[PDB]
């Protein structure tokens, strides 16, 4: 019965850490998507102007 609670606590701690990591990854992915779309639209505008 005690290993059950210990495992529950370990799962909760790992979930919290992985959730922080997931938030960081979401921020990085959103920044990457914004950068990619910015570069793509700049390239398209540059080619049209060319």
């Amino acid at each position: 019965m005690e290993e059950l609670s210990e495992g529950i606590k370990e799962l909760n701690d790992l979930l919290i850490q992985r959730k922080k990591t997931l938030d960081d990854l979401t921020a990085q992915q959103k920044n990457l998507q914004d950068t990619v779309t910015t570069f793509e639209t700049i390239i398209s505008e540059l080619y049209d102007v060319l």
Binding site: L4, I8, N12, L15, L22, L25, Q28
Partner: peptide, 27 residues
């Protein structure tokens, strides 16, 4: 009584880990 709670926590952690791995690969 707490076996169901452990199962729910394990499923939540599995979903979180899958999301994290997918996000890492996408990044």
């Amino acid at each position: 009584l707490q076996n169901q709670e452990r199962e729910k926590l394990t499923r939540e952690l599995d979903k979180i880990n899958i999301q994290s791995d997918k996000l890492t690969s996408s990044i």
